[PDB]
Nucleic acid binder design. Structure first.
Lengths: 57, 74, 94, 116, 136
RNA sequence: UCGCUCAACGGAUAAAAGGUACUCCGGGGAUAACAGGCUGAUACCGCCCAAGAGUUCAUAUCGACGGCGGUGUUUGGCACC
RNA sequence: CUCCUCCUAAAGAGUAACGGAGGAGCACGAAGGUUGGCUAAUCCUGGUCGGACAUCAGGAGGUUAGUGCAAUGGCAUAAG
RNA sequence: CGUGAAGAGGGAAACAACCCAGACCGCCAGCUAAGGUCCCAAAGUCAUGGUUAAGUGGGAAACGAUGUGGAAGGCCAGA
RNA sequence: UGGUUCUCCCCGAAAGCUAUUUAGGUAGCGCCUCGUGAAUUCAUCUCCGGGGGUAGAGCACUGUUUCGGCAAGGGGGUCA
RNA sequence: GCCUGGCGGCCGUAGCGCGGUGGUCCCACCUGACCCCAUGCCGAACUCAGAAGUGAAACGCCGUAGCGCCGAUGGUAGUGUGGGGUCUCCCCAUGCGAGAGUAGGGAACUGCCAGGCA
């Protein structure tokens, strides 16, 4: 793929249970943790679900 | 003067559209019709529609009164 | 007599049209006729001091937009619920 | 309002033949003619049909539209279906009382062979 | 005061008062008293402002009340606890959104109306403006 | 298959009311009275509008119908100590 | 104080309060089965008594009726 | 639904529940979050533009008041 | 009701539902833990298939509500 | 290829009004009912005989927008997620986005027999 890089900007403490599952499906364990996920539209929708707390490059 | 209600009857759709059901599976429990029995589906005495045949659940408006039917398609 | 400057709407929607109103313009539409509907933007306090006349709603108007004058009639006006501000105008071809 | 009453009687008997998926022998009666079709379990289009309106069964008859004419169609629609391989047909009254000409037509198809 | 002659139900829920009003144009008269705030207009307030308008125009020109008090507000007696069922219906309000035309008027000159709608606005708990009829 | 207002309706027994200021014990601020708190419907105080009263004259004085606040001074609400 | 219907109840189910309204503790050998029919309320007009209304006849209307008993879901293929 | 319960840390002066963030241990290392950067007290007496004159900021309503953008009105033939 | 005595490591609740002579007790379930099994089972997102009647809105229905025109019928002085 | 009839698909852009129109081809009333049959009374209906009449009613087809019905575009409402302002209640970013109403559409469209010139 193009394999975008996603990193976690904020934390997952006070968040919805559906938001924490989306960070699980991306693989983000903590703040600053970057991750290397492929560029499918099912990963674009995972990013958009938590775009307030992830930063894509 | 008030204070009484009854137990909730757990009505409504039990198998939605596109779900694969066995025969005899209850598809909707209802009081009136509000959902009529199309192909491969019986009405039942309390109007509980149920799958007469295995297949997928299919809702469609059909008829001269725009009534919602439920077919079953194998 | 009434000649209105207009610009074409680049973005339509809710937050787009709330930005036009906060930036002292307001959206409009020119539908009607053969051609497709034409989403436009007018400036508010120039049209607001022009629709206070009774003949803005009576005679044919002239909306100039990007090199085109379209003979129009005002058709329906959404105003603000309580402030003396317009929110939309419908124009029909004439 | 003769037709508006008759299609009201048929439209319960037309169902339980769509929800059953049965081949419908439908009979249409009228003052001077008598009609019959055999229609597939689908609601689409007929398989065989017979009436007195065809000129084959016109001057083979003393009169069109009586019970001896309905027994002419009764042999006619049945003998033309068995050559296509259609039996186990279901009779639709189509709102008429199963008594007169339409009894005489279903009786003369049961002799000629149509499994009801 | 205004009140429905009958209702199908004695008590209503409290509800909420979110949104903007639907009757926002001067429909019948020439001059209007539009509500720009949001709250509840009890039938005591609607009547007190109906007299204050009518007395200012000296019984001249037609007057429309475009709102109606159709919500039964209950109120528990003093020194009674919480619970023990909903309290007893004591007055009737109209829920008022921003943009509601409260009153309307024609048959008077406008400066007599803006005077009379200023006397009514001091009887209401809701900030209000004076609006006149618009073609479209 | 029958017999249950076992209706306190998952039915303590076949069969069951009270008094206690003579009282007792085990607990509770899980819960009341007092006071504190929170809240202010009520109460009290102020203000807005001005119909009117005041010989004329709304605003010297008073102020109907209605409006908005303050106080924490009552009667309460609550049940936090 | 058990049961039923509606709302609260947040468009699946469920969901509390001494929340808001109502009902049940049966009836029926036909009011069940089936088969063959049928289609209402109200209104107008006509008018033997007969009046707003008995019955009859037409027109309108289209279920505003009816559903042994609450309310809701239904009901013309009628479940009437 | 989130946090507390059963979660310490930073901020909101203090302040279970709010905001930031989830403490394995050590370090006299670094970058940040919310919050902040005159002094108490770590960091801008930052840069450019505007506003306000009340210590507003740093508690409050109806209402009152010449505090400080677009038009409208009757004149260098005099407002 | 009060007390319950050495240490590390791993995980980690609930204060709900239903019953209860029950409501500060208990029981089944829910959630916790340990163990043994099993399926691309589970979650997330995208696309598809669904059913709604909530928010909104609306006023044909059920009620309620103004105002206007009402072809009424006739209160009402009124005539006889 | 129009015309009619059965059965359907479809379910108001298909309905209704209003106007015009069609005959033994078909369909409708219509002739008669003595019997099969049947009306809580009526051959009205159902049903059976058989075509003298008429296309009046019905029923098709063709007109007309009077009425329904359909109905964008834009805007508004609401709202998921995120962050803000404060009695209530909103606003920003982003995603989804009505209802109502305008413009306009619209006098339905379609699979078997029979009839008559082809």
């Amino acid at each position: 793929a193009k394999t975008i890089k996603i990193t976690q900007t904020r934390s997952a403490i006070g968040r919805l249970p559906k938001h924490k599952a989306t960070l699980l499906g991306l693989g983000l364990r903590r703040i600053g943790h970057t991750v290397e996920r492929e560029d499918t539209p099912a990963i674009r929708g995972m990013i958009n679900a938590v775009s307030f707390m992830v930063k894509v490059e | 003067r008030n204070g009484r209600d009854s137990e909730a009857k757990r009505l409504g759709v039990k198998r939605f559209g596109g779900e694969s059901v066995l025969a005899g599976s209850i598809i909707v429990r209802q009081r009136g019709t509000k959902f009529h029995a199309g192909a491969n589906v019986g009405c039942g005495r309390d109007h509980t529609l149920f799958a007469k045949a295995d297949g997928k659940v299919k809702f469609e408006v059909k008829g001269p009164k725009n009534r919602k039917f439920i077919s079953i398609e194998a | 007599m009434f000649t209105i400057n207009a610009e074409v709407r680049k973005e339509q929607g809710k937050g787009a049209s709330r930005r036009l109103r906060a930036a002292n313009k307001f959206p409009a539409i020119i539908y009607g006729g053969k051609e497709a509907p034409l989403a436009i933007e007018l400036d508010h306090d120039k049209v607001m001091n022009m629709q206070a006349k009774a003949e803005f709603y009576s005679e044919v108007l002239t909306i100039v937009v990007d090199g085109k004058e379209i003979k129009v009639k005002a058709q329906d006006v959404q105003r603000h619920p309580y402030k003396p501000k317009l929110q939309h105008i419908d124009f029909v071809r004439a | 309002d003769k037709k508006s009453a008759r299609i009201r009687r048929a439209t319960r008997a037309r169902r339980k033949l769509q929800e059953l998926g049965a081949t419908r022998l439908v009979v249409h009666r009228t003052p001077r003619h008598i009609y019959a079709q055999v229609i597939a379990p689908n609601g689409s289009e007929v398989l065989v049909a017979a009436s007195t309106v065809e000129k084959a069964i016109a001057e083979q008859l003393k009169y069109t539209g009586n019970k001896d004419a309905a027994a002419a169609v009764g042999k006619a629609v049945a003998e033309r279906a068995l050559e296509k391989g259609i039996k186990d047909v279901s009779f639709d009254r189509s709102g008429f009382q199963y008594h007169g000409r339409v009894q005489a037509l279903a009786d003369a198809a049961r002799e000629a062979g149509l499994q009801f | 005061m205004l009140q429905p002659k009958r209702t199908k139900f004695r008590k209503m829920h409290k509800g909420r008062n979110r949104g903007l009003a639907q009757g926002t144009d001067v429909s019948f008269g020439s001059f209007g008293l539009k509500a720009v705030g949001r709250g509840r207009l009890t039938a005591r307030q609607i009547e007190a402002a109906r007299r204050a308008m009518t007395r200012a125009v000296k019984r001249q020109g037609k007057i429309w009340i475009r709102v109606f008090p159709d919500k039964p507000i209950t109120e528990k007696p003093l020194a009674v606890r919480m619970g023990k069922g909903k309290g007893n219906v004591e007055y009737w309000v109209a829920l008022i959104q921003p943009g509601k035309v409260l009153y309307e008027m024609d048959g008077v000159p406008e400066e007599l109306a803006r005077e009379a709608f200023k006397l009514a606005a001091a009887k209401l708990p809701i900030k209000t403006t004076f609006v006149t009829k618009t073609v479209m």
